[model samples]
Target: MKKKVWREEKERLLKMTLEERRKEYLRDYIPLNSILSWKEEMKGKSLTEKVSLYRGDITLLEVDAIVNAANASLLGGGGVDGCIHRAAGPCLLAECRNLNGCDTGHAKITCGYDLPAKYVIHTVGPIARGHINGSHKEDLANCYKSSLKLVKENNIRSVAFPCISTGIYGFPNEPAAVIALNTIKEWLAKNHHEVDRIIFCVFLEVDFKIYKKKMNEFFSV
Candidate 1:
């Protein structure tokens, strides 16, 4: 039953023009600037000005690329990974199959197919369970670093990221946010001109609050 519904939906999506597909996907999202106050304040400041905290669906972003919190297979699991795969259409899965798989802390890129974004950067993050050790922290930080590295290499001017390991992977929200923010900040400080915008896209309200507080501490004057 589920497969039948998705097959119909995929056919419908494939029939639409790229513009129509983007318009359809964007119906659920409001302009990010309207809701985020820091967008105004951070303007013309430091590299922080290029960073944003967005609480919404990552798959709907009309940026150069969006990061997918994927597993080693990169075939599609739950959470953001599954959502992205579904949004991009079955062609994404076909492309992913050719790529074999991605390793934890690393990333791979593919065309977004039906998604609003031009590309999808799939990064496999460490599954930390209850206890996060030194290696887990390094892996999580590398997930951000690796994704941004692809963004720079591909000349992608804007990108959106979900909380990489904080979902069902059990990496803990606050700590994951800290690693994500700090890692991106460090990368942007040196290569600030490589990209125009980097969004921390959160789906949950708790994550929104955590990212808001952390962004103030890390980016605000």
Candidate 2:
């Protein structure tokens, strides 16, 4: 991709009205028919191919990478972890077990042998058990940073994420999105050139609203 051309296009997008740019960029999300689709899918139904979400398991995507809401063990479990393992075939578990396990609030990577995505990035997020402190905040932030670091290192500019502990791990979706949005904003500020896109693959209507609100506060549009 031409750097100058990409910059120009970004500028064009930046100048558009928020609604216009959002629609223009995210138009790839076909109208799923209702807000309940938001709860079911947990993704933005976004129109832009670069940053998008589907109504199902992300490992089914043929993108540069698919994020896994993994247990520290890296072995198969509930939500995305089990789904990915099943779709990626049995070799995935074998590889995961070999790695021992991922630490809490950290991430690791592996090849996406049997899944649609080319690679898999498993990130362990903090258990949001009613605490509302900075450490919890920092851990949530690290989830995004760690995932982004691994993805960029592996040359994956296009990636998709699950809500990450929001479902099974009990982290409230709204607060998690805030931590996510802030972390991405700060990361992009310094490392903007490293990765071309960042996606907050949301799974619920409430989560989407939180992201929308934060984007307004942090960005011009």
Candidate 3:
């Protein structure tokens, strides 16, 4: 029910003129206090050059790109995938339609039409039907790693990621999140200056806190 309302609202907003949409949209300029200060983060960094946590909408960020936790269809399903497509307006879907379809653990990129983000990177996460195993976990890791690799190749400065596979797909949040953070950190360590920033844009409070704790551990020098 909530997801349906959210989708309807996004579609409605996309129907409006740019001026009207901007007037109704509340752009949040403030940074999250839950995140470590940028300087403090710089003071302690080994695994990744820089990482940040955001606890609101990912579509609102004016970053180089935002990642969509999409399914193979790439047309959009639910959760972040649907929100991204709806927020991006119909043009996004049209572009996606040309890309055939992405496979699980793989990703494809497209322009962000109406959304604040410049581009959208779509990756399909593992759909854990039962208890997750090594293959399932590897697929999840590839979702993040593959997205970042695409980001690097495109020279995107920053990208935002949502918790992949942790929604109706049945992936346990803790394990999935651990894969997200660790995989991203490993990629960043190797990619280094290829990209400037990576933001874990989580909607859930628990996810926000857990990412913070994990980042703190990573920064523990």
Candidate 4:
């Protein structure tokens, strides 16, 4: 039943005219200022003032860009990669084909197409298999770093990131969350002014809890 609904939605989006898509995108876009409840908590919280924990579909976000946990192929596989590709429409794949492919820990960018976001940053994260080593950890960290580099270079004011490598790639949830938050924190400290907002977008309840717990420790008021 869910699959059927998804297929129908995909077709509907693919068939939409550019003007229709633009209108829909505008309707779906969620501005940071509109989330009134979070505004008070963000006050005086320098590091976290620009950061938010969003538990939902990243594709629905109306940010400048959203990160895709893409495989090396950049051709779209499963998890966040497939969701992002489907939401962005076929044009995203057409553009991705032209970029060749990305290496582990590296990233590339493309237009968001049908998605509410303006751009999508695709990053290849390491496959941890059973055990994660130093190289794997570094590679995971690099994924965030590389994505942020593109985010800054492209002048993206707001961006959202999924839990890269933690799904079918077999990266453990807690460690992956740790690496993501820490790496992003360090990067934002220096380049804080470059970007206006950063969203840690999580789809799973586990990831949401993990990020919520860690945010206090990392960005304590």
Whole-model Cα lDDT of every candidate shown, in order: 0.80, 0.63, 0.77, 0.81
What order do you get sorting by lDDT, best first?
Answer: 4, 1, 3, 2
Candidate numbers sorted by TM-score from highest down: 4, 1, 3, 2
Highest TM-score, which number? 4
Better of 1 and 4 by TM-score: 4
Task: Please identify which of the two predictions, 3 or 4, would achieve the higher TM-score against the true structure.
Answer: 4
List model 2 lDDT by residue over 136-195, tens digit each: 677777878899898768777666777776866777888777677676666666665665
Return the top candidate by lDDT.
Answer: 4
TM-score list, all predictions: 0.83, 0.71, 0.80, 0.84
Off by over 4 Å in 2: 1-56, 219-221
lDDT at residue 215 of model 4 (Cα atoms): 79
Which 10 consecutive residues of model 3 have the lowest summed lDDT?
29-38
Tens digits of per-residue lDDT for model 1, 40-71: 65553666568887767887677778998888
- How big is the positional error of residue 183 in model 4, measured in Å on the Cα after superposition? 0.5
Which is the winner by lDDT between candidate 3 and candidate 4?
4
Question: What lDDT would candidate 1 get against the real structure?
Answer: 0.80
In terms of TM-score, how similar is model 3 to the real structure? Answer: 0.80
Question: Number of clashes in model 1?
Answer: 0
Q: How does residue 82 of candidate 1 score in lDDT? A: 86
* Worst 10 contiguous positions by lDDT, candidate 2: 30-39
